[PDB]
Amino acid sequence: LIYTAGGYFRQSLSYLEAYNPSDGTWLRLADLQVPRSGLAGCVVGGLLYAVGGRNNSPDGNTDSSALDCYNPMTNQWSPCAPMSVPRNRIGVGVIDGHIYAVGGSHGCIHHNSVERYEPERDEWHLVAPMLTRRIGVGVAVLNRLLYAVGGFDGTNRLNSAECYYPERNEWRMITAMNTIRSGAGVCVLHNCIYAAGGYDGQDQLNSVERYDVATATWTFVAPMKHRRSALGITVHQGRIYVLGGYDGHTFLDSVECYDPDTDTWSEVTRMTSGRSGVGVAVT
């Protein structure tokens, strides 16, 4: 099902709320040990991981270097080794088991650093950093390659995207998106990299566009109904779900669904409560 961990509405949240569009409604599960927003969700071996973020509370604002797994049979969280640095507004992209932690911020410092960690040695090792410092970065994996998409460098919000070549441990700039997007929702559907919504420094976005690898072009697809940045995103059996986010005024509970074969974005259902900055994955 579609799980969402963390988020923010007045303070960082511990929530965990699996959803099933074939079930129709939601389900509440084990709370995160430490509240988190600006985190990323990913599944490795059915094991739902929660990476980086921060706890923005009435008594603090602690950037999280933590990594935490939730076995969905046992319903219990478990602390795994911590990253080299805290990463608020992180991106992550699963790659043959090993988890990739991308960019993010710690205080004033916008990372270009990247580090990996797999469920075996439970260690973090720094790899080549990105060409760009990126927080609010969207991350995707296509043909066993890692794409970092959009984000914010401290001063400029980005339309650029860059690709990590593991066998060479270097980053290469690719064709930029048509739109500057920080805090967008980025995922692979079919074999295109999708990039939905985000913020360009003036306005939240409802536009969506997708990247075709063979032609290296970013085609503009159907836009969503409600502009949103800091949204969750995931693909559930060949369709796209965006959950929550911020539109400059409101913390959204709206969940829209994109149907590719018709190119239409419909609002299937909403969340139990509006929130931004969640981690989303599927297992």
Binding site: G38, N56, R89, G183, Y199, S229, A230, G248, G277
Partner: peptide, 9 residues
């Protein structure tokens, strides 16, 4: 509130 995430400073 953060223009992008809405979170407080």
């Amino acid at each position: 509130a953060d223009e992008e995430t809405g979170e407080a400073a």
